[PDB]
């Protein structure tokens, strides 16, 4: 609400960083089948729950 | 069944509302000055205590042992005016507003804020318009018989203190409340006991009087004295019941 604690802001920063597209080279690694990921979170679909 | 409202009144929600109250109305600590002579204080404030029908008197006293002024919270007697002098002790004059030992007062005197025991700092006759009458004295094993507002006779040690006069506030119960709002405002600053729902208007799970196709108690409302909580409702240990026309 624009009035957030330091812990809340750090958690939001962590959530934002864990939302980026996956680089393709890691998926192309031999023996690595990361490929597509359903871990992607949208602000309007799945809430963080603090 | 279910726990009744009487059992639920053990605290919590049903605690007294004491935010706006100005302090306890204890007389004073029985010290050497009050035990051997008197001490003169000056009343400086007369204030209204919410939840109490009688005004309270803020009275300033000089500390005998320290350079300091002590303020008390006397229960104001009728005729008390700010700036007057009150005297507390054995040798105090028999004047309205003065605090004297009960045993040092003449028989038949009218007092207020009387102590049940020495040093109790006021127990009897504290409500507005109420007072205690000194019935008699008994020097041998010094005890004073007094008459309480309820009409009972109580024996107290002949060293308990009392305030000469009648508690201020007059007869407050002589005016009809006339409105549920007036009753609501009266009890709001006292506690959560209003309004009250009748037991016969309840269900059997709620009250012993609840249930039935008609609103009726079903059994006698006079219950024995040694009733368990939850069934001690109605008229507890009623010696008599009904309208009485003439008795002592």
């Amino acid at each position: 609400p624009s009035h957030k604690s330091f812990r809340t802001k750090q958690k939001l920063a962590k959530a934002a960083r864990q939302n980026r597209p996956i680089p393709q080279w890691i998926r192309l690694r031999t023996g690595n089948t990361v490929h597509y990921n359903m871990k992607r979170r949208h602000w309007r679909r799945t809430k963080l729950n603090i | 069944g279910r726990v009744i409202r009487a059992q639920r009144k053990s605290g919590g929600i049903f605690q007294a509302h004491t935010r706006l109250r100005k302090g306890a109305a204890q007389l004073r600590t029985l010290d050497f000055a009050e035990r051997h002579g008197y001490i003169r204080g000056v009343v400086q404030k007369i204030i209204h205590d919410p939840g109490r029908g009688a005004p309270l008197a803020k009275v300033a006293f000089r500390n005998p042992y320290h350079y300091r002024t002590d303020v008390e919270t006397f229960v104001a007697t009728e005729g008390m005016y700010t700036g007057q002098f009150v005297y507390c002790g054995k040798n105090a004059a028999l004047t309205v507003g003065n605090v004297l030992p009960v045993g040092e007062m003449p028989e038949g005197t009218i007092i207020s804020n009387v102590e049940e025991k020495a040093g109790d700092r006021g127990a009897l006759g504290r409500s507005s318009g109420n007072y205690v009458i000194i019935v008699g004295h008994d020097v041998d094993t010094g005890k004073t018989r007094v008459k309480l507002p309820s009409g009972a006779k109580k024996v107290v040690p002949s060293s308990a203190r009392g305030v000469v006069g009648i508690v201020a506030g007059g007869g407050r119960i002589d005016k009809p409340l006339l409105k549920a709002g007036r009753a609501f405002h009266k009890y709001r600053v006292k506690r959560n006991c209003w309004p009250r729902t009748r037991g016969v208007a309840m269900n059997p799970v709620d009250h012993p009087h609840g249930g039935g196709n008609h609103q009726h108690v079903g059994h006698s409302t006079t219950v024995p004295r040694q009733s368990a909580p939850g069934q001690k409702v109605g008229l507890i240990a009623a010696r008599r019941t009904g309208l009485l026309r003439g008795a002592a």
């Binding site: - | 404030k45 007369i46 204030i47 209204h48 029908g53 009688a54 005004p55 008197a57 104001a76 007697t77 009728e78 005729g79 008390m80 005016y81 700010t82 700036g83 004059a93 028999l94 004047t95 309205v96 003449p106 038949g108 005197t109 009218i110 507005s128 318009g129 007072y131 000469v164 006069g165 009648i166 201020a168 506030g169 007059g170 007869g171 407050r172 002589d174 005016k175 009809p176 006339l178 409105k179």
Partner: protein, 93 residues
């Protein structure tokens, strides 16, 4: 104009609460909202505040009196004052 045959101050209550209750309240409020004389200043300026406190204004005698619910002095208190005065005189003499 008279504006009221008998209700007087209780005209604010309309027709509710009953005639006897309105009459009793009318007497009480007439006593309650009355200017009284300061026993130390001699001016008819004593007014009630919060059911037992009576104060009079002016440059002097700003005393606050502990009185009755709606009268400065009650009959019972006056009788008690006379009784205490009598007892004090007997003890002194």
């Amino acid at each position: 104009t008279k504006r009221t045959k008998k209700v007087g101050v209780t005209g604010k209550y309309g027709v509710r609460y009953g005639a006897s209750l309105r009459r009793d309240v009318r007497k009480i409020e007439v006593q309650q909202h009355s200017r009284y004389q300061c026993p130390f200043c001699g001016r008819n300026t004593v007014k009630r505040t919060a059911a037992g406190i009576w104060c009079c204004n002016g440059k002097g005698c700003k005393k606050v009196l502990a009185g009755g619910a709606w009268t400065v002095t009650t009959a019972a208190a006056t009788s008690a004052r006379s009784t205490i005065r009598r007892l004090r005189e007997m003890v002194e003499v």
